[PDB]
Amino acid sequence: MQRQFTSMLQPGVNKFSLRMFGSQKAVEKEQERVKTAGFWIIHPYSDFRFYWDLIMLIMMVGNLVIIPVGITFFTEQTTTPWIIFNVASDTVFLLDLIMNFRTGTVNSSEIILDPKVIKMNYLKSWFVVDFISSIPVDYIFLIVEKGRALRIVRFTKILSLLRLLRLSRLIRYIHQWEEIFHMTYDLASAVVRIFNLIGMMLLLCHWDGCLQFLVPLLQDFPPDCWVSLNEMVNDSWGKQYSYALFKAMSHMLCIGYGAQAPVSMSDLWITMLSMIVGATCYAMFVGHATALIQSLDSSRRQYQEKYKQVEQYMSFHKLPADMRQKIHDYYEHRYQGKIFDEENILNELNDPLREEIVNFNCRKLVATMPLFANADPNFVTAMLSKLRFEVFQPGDYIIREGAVGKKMYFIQHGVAGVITKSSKEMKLTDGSYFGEICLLTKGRRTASVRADTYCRLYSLSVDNFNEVLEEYPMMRRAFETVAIDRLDRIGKKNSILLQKFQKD
Amino acid sequence: MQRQFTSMLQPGVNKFSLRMFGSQKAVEKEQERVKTAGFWIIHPYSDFRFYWDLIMLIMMVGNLVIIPVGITFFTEQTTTPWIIFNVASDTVFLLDLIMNFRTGTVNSSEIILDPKVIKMNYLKSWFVVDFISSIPVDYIFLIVEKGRALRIVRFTKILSLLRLLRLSRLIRYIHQWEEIFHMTYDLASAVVRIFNLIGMMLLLCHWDGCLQFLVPLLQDFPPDCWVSLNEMVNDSWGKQYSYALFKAMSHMLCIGYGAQAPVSMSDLWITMLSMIVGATCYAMFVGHATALIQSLDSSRRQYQEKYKQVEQYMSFHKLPADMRQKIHDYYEHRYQGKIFDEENILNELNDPLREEIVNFNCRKLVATMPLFANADPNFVTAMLSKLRFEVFQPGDYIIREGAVGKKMYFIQHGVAGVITKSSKEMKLTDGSYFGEICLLTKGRRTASVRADTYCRLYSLSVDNFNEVLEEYPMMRRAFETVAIDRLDRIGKKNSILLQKFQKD
Amino acid sequence: MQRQFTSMLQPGVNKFSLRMFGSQKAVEKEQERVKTAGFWIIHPYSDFRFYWDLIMLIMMVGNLVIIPVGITFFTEQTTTPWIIFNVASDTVFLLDLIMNFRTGTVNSSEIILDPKVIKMNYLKSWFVVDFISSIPVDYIFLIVEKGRALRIVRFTKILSLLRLLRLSRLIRYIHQWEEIFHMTYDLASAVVRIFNLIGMMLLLCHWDGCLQFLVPLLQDFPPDCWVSLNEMVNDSWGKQYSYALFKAMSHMLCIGYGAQAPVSMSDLWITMLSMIVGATCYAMFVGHATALIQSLDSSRRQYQEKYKQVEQYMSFHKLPADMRQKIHDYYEHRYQGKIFDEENILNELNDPLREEIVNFNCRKLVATMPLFANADPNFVTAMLSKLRFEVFQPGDYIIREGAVGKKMYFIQHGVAGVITKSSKEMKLTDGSYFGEICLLTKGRRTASVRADTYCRLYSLSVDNFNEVLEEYPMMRRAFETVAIDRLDRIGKKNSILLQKFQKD
Amino acid sequence: MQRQFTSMLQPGVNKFSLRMFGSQKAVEKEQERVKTAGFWIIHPYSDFRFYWDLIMLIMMVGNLVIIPVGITFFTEQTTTPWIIFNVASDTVFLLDLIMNFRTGTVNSSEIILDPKVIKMNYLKSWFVVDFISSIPVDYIFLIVEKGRALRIVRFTKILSLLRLLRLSRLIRYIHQWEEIFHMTYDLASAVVRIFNLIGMMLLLCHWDGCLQFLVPLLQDFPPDCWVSLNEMVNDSWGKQYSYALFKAMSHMLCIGYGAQAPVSMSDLWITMLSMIVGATCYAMFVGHATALIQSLDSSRRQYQEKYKQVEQYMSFHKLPADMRQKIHDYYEHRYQGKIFDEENILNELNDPLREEIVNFNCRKLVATMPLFANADPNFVTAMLSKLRFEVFQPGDYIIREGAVGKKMYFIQHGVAGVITKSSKEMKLTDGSYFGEICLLTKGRRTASVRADTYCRLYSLSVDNFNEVLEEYPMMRRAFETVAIDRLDRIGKKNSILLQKFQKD
Numbered sequence A, B, C, D: 001m002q003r004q005f006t007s008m009l010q011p012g013v014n015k016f017s018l019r020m021f022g023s024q025k026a027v028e029k030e031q032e033r034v035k036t037a038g039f040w041i042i043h044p045y046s047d048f049r050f051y052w053d054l055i056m057l058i059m060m061v062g063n064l065v066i067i068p069v070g071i072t073f074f075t076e077q078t079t080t081p082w083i084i085f086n087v088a089s090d091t092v093f094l095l096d097l098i099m100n101f102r103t104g105t106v107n108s109s110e111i112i113l114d115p116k117v118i119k120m121n122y123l124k125s126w127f128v129v130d131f132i133s134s135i136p137v138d139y140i141f142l143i144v145e146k147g148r149a150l151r152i153v154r155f156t157k158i159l160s161l162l163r164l165l166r167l168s169r170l171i172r173y174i175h176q177w178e179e180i181f182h183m184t185y186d187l188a189s190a191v192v193r194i195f196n197l198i199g200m201m202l203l204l205c206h207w208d209g210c211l212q213f214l215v216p217l218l219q220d221f222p223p224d225c226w227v228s229l230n231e232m233v234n235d236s237w238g239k240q241y242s243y244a245l246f247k248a249m250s251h252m253l254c255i256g257y258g259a260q261a262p263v264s265m266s267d268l269w270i271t272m273l274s275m276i277v278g279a280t281c282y283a284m285f286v287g288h289a290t291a292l293i294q295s296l297d298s299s300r301r302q303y304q305e306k307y308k309q310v311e312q313y314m315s316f317h318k319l320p321a322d323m324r325q326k327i328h329d330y331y332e333h334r335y336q337g338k339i340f341d342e343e344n345i346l347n348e349l350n351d352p353l354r355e356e357i358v359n360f361n362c363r364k365l366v367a368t369m370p371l372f373a374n375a376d377p378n379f380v381t382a383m384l385s386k387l388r389f390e391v392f393q394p395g396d397y398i399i400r401e402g403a404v405g406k407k408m409y410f411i412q413h414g415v416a417g418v419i420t421k422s423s424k425e426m427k428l429t430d431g432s433y434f435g436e437i438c439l440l441t442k443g444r445r446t447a448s449v450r451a452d453t454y455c456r457l458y459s460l461s462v463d464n465f466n467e468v469l470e471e472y473p474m475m476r477r478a479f480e481t482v483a484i485d486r487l488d489r490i491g492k493k494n495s496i497l498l499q500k501f502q503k504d
């Protein structure tokens, strides 16, 4: 199963991968490139690499949690199981270190050159810290000593603490994979940021708890320390840890001290350090929280902000209360508490998508109308692209009689009434259009039109209409025919239209 | 009164409802849809549902407040009145649970399918938690036991604590109804968010207060606990609660500990937990406050921000101080400390509304002018739509003599003076227009015009004017006539105009 | 001096007033309106009113500071000087109350109707609180009693505390005058908001300090209170106040308790209340600070944000590093770290201002050029309005030979070199223009032009140029002449131009 | 080496300098201006000045750190080394003061007038504070005394504290140079702001630590002070300082008190003051942190915000889930999680840069296409400027057969298939163009085109195409030829094209 291994090493065709590299052909090229170095090089966005990093993360986390505690509260640090654990952990880290040379880096296109690009760049960047972390230094030191004890013991713990420098690597890994996870699952940034901070914060607290206890151990439990004053040196490890952790935590969240304020200088300085660390962390957390909160209601906030401008405008012109109310109502009907700019979004989209959206919007209208179903779909598409959405309140004159008409209408939803001299009352339903005659006749509006209820209309401008009809002269005839009947019903004969019909 | 009940079950025609569903016809359709399931199904936006939720909220709140306290500070938990209270409360919750199957869900259109849509979705979503909360588990356990006591008693309290899981339901309800309340009364989001948080925070504090006391009770008041060290075990319930609450509250708001720092591990851990809960809550509160504050002065802030850009621009070109001052003055006059973009807002509005606004703005002007009152209102409307607002400072040449004039003017407010060679001094008042001759003659400006005080003018561009006058050729004649007299007064005869008049 | 008084009562012609009311004539109208009610009514924006409010504010502040302290720490509350102070203060407040009926309200235009508008609205709005505050209730109570003592004494202090309800009025006044002060001196909003909060916060702290001491006094110094445990009942007033204030302050800023955690319930509850008040206040302060900070660097922040978008764009297209660097350099040269949009700002301004700005920008250019100084200033104005600012980096081909030229140029600043076949090297200085021939000839570019150093140019488009020259055909001749000489120098004869010259 | 000195005094030609002054010629002018005053005046942006300020900053920092400590914890303040240090420090400050008269100020152009502009402005601005700081006042006082001791000693320390007023100058310097450093290295503002605050905060803490100890020293260690209660008067200086610092720091970060709550009034008041200082500082820090955090993820946040609007839009129209998914996919492909507006950025850039960018984008396309490599580069440039980027998803009809075609295409990347009646299957690769025939023929689309995979296309509109081809009629012929072959292959003969070819 070498082929399988090879496949694993190369980048898979994931959704994220596709997004990164565009087409699938492009992905293949990357794979081919990878193939140059055999049974050695690993691509940064590979599946195997992901798995490896996952493996690392758990282990790393454990080490960060467990190691300090082990160093501090357990004096028997040369016992079997512990030793076994340590060596094994070190091995994994060593392996990881080795892998980083095989692993490709990303800066432009990813650096796939094995001996030159990856090795020489990594050796001058992060290799120094990593190497120290990977190797078991304390054990080496012990071996050296082998080939007066208290001092040695004291020294060893500090040396062992070098194994905690793996945190940097962990951080790096998190930063890498989190970016990848944004391009997969569409994560909210703020949430992610807060979670990381929380993880960091807790870790720091833990370290402080360990650290505070540790200094006394290192300093041989002097009587003016906090451990000796409470008389909990001979108490169980767990209790001590808890107390230490509590002490650390208080400083972090700005509560208080331990049993008493620190007496000895060493203790005092440690406390101060913790406070400095803690307070800053807390501040950062607060900031993060604020950011998160702002993000969460950003959609709602924005709308309100936009509306505020409208209010200000009104104030500037000193409009009557009634008028203001009307405007407010209109706004409510139009946007329904949702900020967006159709002009921008539609522009951003491509043609087919736009068509799809438009069709969905006006599907009902299309179904209703007799002209739209029979004619070619291309014509329909042409028509619906040029439409512009409008909302009218009840008691608004949509068209006034005698004016110069720039735009016709299409009733998607609601009921509008027609008013003409000696025409009684005529009411229009959904899937009806009005204002077609003034654009055809090139004259004035034959009669007034006023909305009965709230009317949701799709307007079409004159120029657009003309453009549409230059492409499809057969559809104009139908329109003309429709107009003529309406005119007859009304009682106002348009002569030009009649002439045109005769000609036809 | 079954009809009434049915009506209640169906959605009413509220303002919010109208907003949601658009037209009233649409609302009727929803009602009809609801009617399919008889004496069973309840619509989410129904009036009855609202009332039910209101009923729940009070009760729920009471339970959240009262239950924990009861569990903790009252050992006599099997007494009559308490028992009566508990059972009754449980009944209501059970009823509510039953209702959720009858209640429709909102995701698109609301799911009105009774046996399939509502029941199967809710059973796999929130039913598990709810059911546990509703049932009186402790009593059931007791019954089971009936069909050594201390342990049982200890167990029972924890079981009873399951009744506090109703909080989730409460939260859900709040989230639902708050959305509805945004679409009714136009609430500020930030305020709402803060209030909810406050409610939550207080509740949490209360729980902590209860919780802290509770552990000692559960653990049988060990001598190293905070209750036994203060010697307030046998003190009255209320005092204990207060002290406990105080302790909780301090941790929340980051003040301090109780009488002393916790000695026993159990206490210590509890304290730590509280601190973790408390600190985070505080941070969240701070964030919310920040958000609120930003929202409150957002209208003011924005203006300032906008102005800052202007200042920066000036700095970039390194303008003289005098010039800068002038610009500042202009800005002050123009916007009056109010950020808004007329171009956007007007576009957003529909035609009738625009007309109304324009009319209100220029009502005074219309009243003043002799031409506007006599002519058709359509013409007036056409004119006023195309107008563009402008502000001039005293000592600014509005028109310079001999230039090519692109726009005429209309004095809404202020006083402007005309300057011509051997024309002495002429001053114009509100409701007067100037700059009409260059657009009619299609030549140069006959004389200069300079503002006396601050002038608020409505400009009309040449193209727009032409457009207006192609529709109404009768109004042009009047303009021409007006011009001729003015020309005569001046002493500069325009020949083309004269010719036109002769022709007429 | 009744006339003077009358004048004072009426609104003065301040800058703020002018801004509010527009023209000075308008202000006069307001004064006339005011005149309807004689020796009675006061305008809200009057000078006298301002002075009155100033007088109030100091007094009010003093009362807020002094009264609580007096109530608490001085048992001898019936002494002479104190009595004198109190009565006098009350008198002023009573007078202020009376004034509010005379004072006009602002909602639209300000309500100047004396008996109906001002009196009936204020009587149902804020009169209840105010009246109570104004009257000396404690003294009245004492009088009543006159026409067992300890209880009475206890009662009286609480009654006196009603005089602290003037805070509301103070707040109102501050809110009023701060708005006015925005329209005078162009204050930063955030700063103002923070200052108010600080004032409020300190006041609250003071009250808490007083309040904490006060309860013990009211409760007769019970031995389980904080005052009796420290044994500072018989200590001097000042020390007590300080300690009390300290205690209050700690709760506000989240430090700690007093000497010990509160023992008695009353004390405990008070402490809790203070904490609730304090913590919230602190949160608010933090929010305000955040807001202020964001405001302060908003000009800088915005620029950075804008740039970030550019960077993102570059990243999207995956541009070479060199190219990116070039772009960065260009950006630096163009905007100089200053965000602004000329297109918007210029549109916002009126014509004369624009002209002034343009002239200032291109004054140097005008001075340099021989054509601009001799010709009419109108022509110059026309030219300079249509110009568009551009920046070029050294080594950029401004014009390439043989291309179709849409725009000519004007060198404001920097040095550009001309490159033609067998033309050697020609270098242009400030106040020189190039690219004029392609627009005149209506053909192709005669020769290439490349920048030597960083060149700051003003471009003029073809259409604009044509527009300019239709108005002024005499200036075209000069241009033609200039071109011809250049052509001769080059060695490339343009025939059309020659023909035109011949015709001329 | 006087020439060198002179050079140093004058402004160097740095990058920052260039940015400030534009061209290098301009810089020379500044130098010339500087030359008017000889061996005296120093320019604000000079290199020497920078160095001087750097020198000051270290020294100033040291003084701020060291002086207070010296004043407080060392009673032997008249010893040799200390004296030597003090005098030397004073000398430097005196020199700096002298320099400020020689140093030019910046307000517009920098004030280079030596006796009038720089001296008279600085003498009325900041000279008062500075002078006091510079002079050794304590020593002068001592001298005066020379030409009962305890009181004198007490006095002297306070006088010496005047030397701490150099902080203002330091602040000023920082504010100056930080602005300069923004215009050099493109620093993130937020980071800079936070760092300054941190520096300030620490300094304040230090001062508080010193200050707290100092009052006892001044007050002669009264037994009710915090130093005497802990019995650490005779302890070493360092320990005392640490304890004092700790005490200060706790108040700053809101932890607690020292050993006990303050007993004496003096101590108490000091503590309160510290708390006031501390809390405010902490709040400010929090605000700064928040600002920083918002800045850091602003690029990411913005994108998310933008997307939210899209989501809202979708919600408003109530689109199907499938459709929504499609839209999401499109968005992901198009922008790749990166907010930017090409329309704005490109407008902001100049022509050459745009050309460069466009060329880089379409270099591959150019390489691919046979027509583009052979023809003139000018033509290519013309073509590529007018192109518009578009993205298509697999299964989208790019062109539908029979429609009126407004735009042709260019396949940068991906694979698109052509569909015609009885044409089998034809597939196009990168560097191929389609949609050219409808623009040439001025008719309808000959056949449909649908994307196979994700297609990245560059569209060219009809009008733009026409514009391009009016300039280059030779390139049209090639296009026609290409079309004809394609038509032949298809089987649909276009007659007009054929006619044109014949004519040619």
Ligand SMILES: Nc1ncnc2c1ncn2[C@@H]1O[C@@H]2COP(=O)(O)O[C@H]2[C@H]1O
Pocket: C399, C405, C418, C426, C433, C434, C435, C436, C437, C438, C439, C444, C445, C446, C447, C448, C449, C486, C487, C489, C490
């Ligand atoms: N000898 C010259 N001196 C100054 N400018 C020139 C000379 N020759 C050409 N130019 C300018 O360089 C430009 C090149 O393109 P145009 O033909 O648009 O217009 C040309 C002139 O404006």
